[PDB]
Write a protein that binds this ligand. Structure first.
Ligand SMILES: *[C@@H]1O[C@H](CO)[C@@H](O[C@@H]2O[C@H](CO)[C@@H](O)[C@H](O)[C@H]2NC(C)=O)[C@H](O)[C@H]1NC(C)=O
Ligand code: CA
Length: 367
């Protein structure tokens, strides 16, 4: 029986590989990207909720289908929480072994998650459309409750892009909790794609979302010049300065994950090695992916969800939070699962058929 659950886990993990999907399989289980969601929202959200919003380029059918609503969802009784995966991954598997498992069956959260086609590798401007639609749609079918957003890696960058160009979504998000975000992209993408940045032809073929996540990319530059480098809602950014093998730089105020707060809406910038320094293993070495099981990450998420404003380092009992390797309620097996999540993602990055020399054109709205 325990065998059947491992077989089904592996099958669900492999269905997220685009090479396997090319054989005609679809993402399965919690990574299903063809969900049937038949409730309508209280208000027109398509093609625009606000006449200030950027247009959608993707059909509402596809936008809505990437949202995975568990049967246990309470449509507003609890506060909804939308989970957003990172590059090469799906919302189901990015968080099922970590944060979303911990947020299943509690009173202050009600999880749903995004399964974007092609493992979040496609143009990030369209990944951003998925987050914008999800915020408006989930709220609009949940009694117009506020939602929260938790993201991993490019997910946070996608959320800032939805906030920047879909203003209507700012009004409905109590908390944005990005884990290992790259709000300034990453120079490791410039290196791997042998690419000058600024959308220039580079010698390394790379997925569109990878090219747009270069440190100086047109996507990142446009987003930051439009306001994407400052928080729009209370933002609890959690990142590791030792060592993020995907996102660099990633330490101090210069970290790609650092969100400024010029609008004064409230921000926490938590480098775990800083916050937990001298106080336990949770201040030790954490990867881009292993951060998702760090107790500081979980503690700051719950704090943010149970209090006005962002998660508060100073309100936490750092002596207790920092004292363990993994969040309470996970085992060291979560450390293993999250390593496999990263491997699957890596495979996707290396083997995705849509490799390009140049970064997607900015849509007319971003320019
Ligand atoms: C839902 O979240 C939004 C954004 O965090 C909240 O809207 C902000 O509310 C504060 C004070 O209530 C205002 O000063 C800001 O200008 C608002 N921001 C935006 C962009 O609207 C809103 O209060 C939350 N709603 C609920 C019911 O929690
Ligand atoms: Ca809060």
């Amino acid at each position: 029986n325990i065998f059947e659950n491992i077989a089904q886990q592996i099958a669900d993990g492999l269905s997220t590989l685009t090479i396997v999907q090319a054989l005609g399989f679809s993402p399965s289980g919690e990574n299903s990207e063809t969900n049937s969601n038949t409730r309508e929202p209280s208000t027109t959200i398509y093609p625009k909720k606000s006449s200030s919003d950027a247009p959608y380029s993707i059909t509402e059918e596809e936008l809505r289908q990437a949202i995975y609503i568990p049967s246990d969802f309470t449509y507003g009784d609890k506060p909804p929480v939308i989970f957003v995966p990172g590059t090469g991954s799906y919302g189901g598997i990015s968080f099922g072994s970590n944060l979303r498992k911990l947020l299943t069956g509690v009173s202050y959260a009600d999880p749903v998650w995004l399964n974007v086609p092609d493992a979040l590798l496609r143009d990030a401007q369209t990944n951003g459309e998925f987050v914008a639609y999800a915020i408006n749609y989930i709220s609009g079918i949940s009694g117009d409750a506020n939602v929260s957003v938790v993201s991993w890696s490019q997910g946070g960058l996608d959320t800032q892009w939805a906030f920047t160009y879909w203003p209507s979504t700012r009004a409905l998000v109590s908390d944005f909790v990005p884990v290992s975000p790259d709000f300034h992209g990453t120079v490791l993408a410039n290196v791997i794609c042998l690419n000058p940045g600024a959308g220039g032809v580079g010698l390394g073929p790379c997925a569109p979302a990878v090219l747009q996540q270069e440190y100086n990319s047109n996507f990142v530059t446009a987003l930051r010049a439009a306001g994407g480098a400052d928080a729009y809602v209370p933002t609890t950014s959690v990142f590791s300065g030792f060592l993020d093998e995907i996102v660099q730089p990633q330490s101090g105020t210069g970290a790609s994950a650092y969100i400024n707060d010029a609008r004064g809406v409230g921000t926490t910038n938590a480098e775990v090695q800083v916050v937990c320094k001298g106080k336990g293993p949770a201040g030790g070495f954490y990867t881009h992916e292993s951060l998702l099981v760090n107790p500081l990450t979980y503690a700051l998420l719950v704090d943010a969800l149970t209090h006005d404003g962002p998660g508060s380092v100073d309100r936490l009992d750092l002596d207790t939070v920092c004292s363990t390797v993994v969040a309470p309620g996970l085992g060291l097996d979560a450390l293993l699962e999250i390593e496999g999540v990263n491997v699957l993602a890596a495979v996707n990055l290396l083997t995705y058929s849509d490799r390009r020399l140049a970064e997607p054109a900015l849509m007319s709205y971003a320019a």
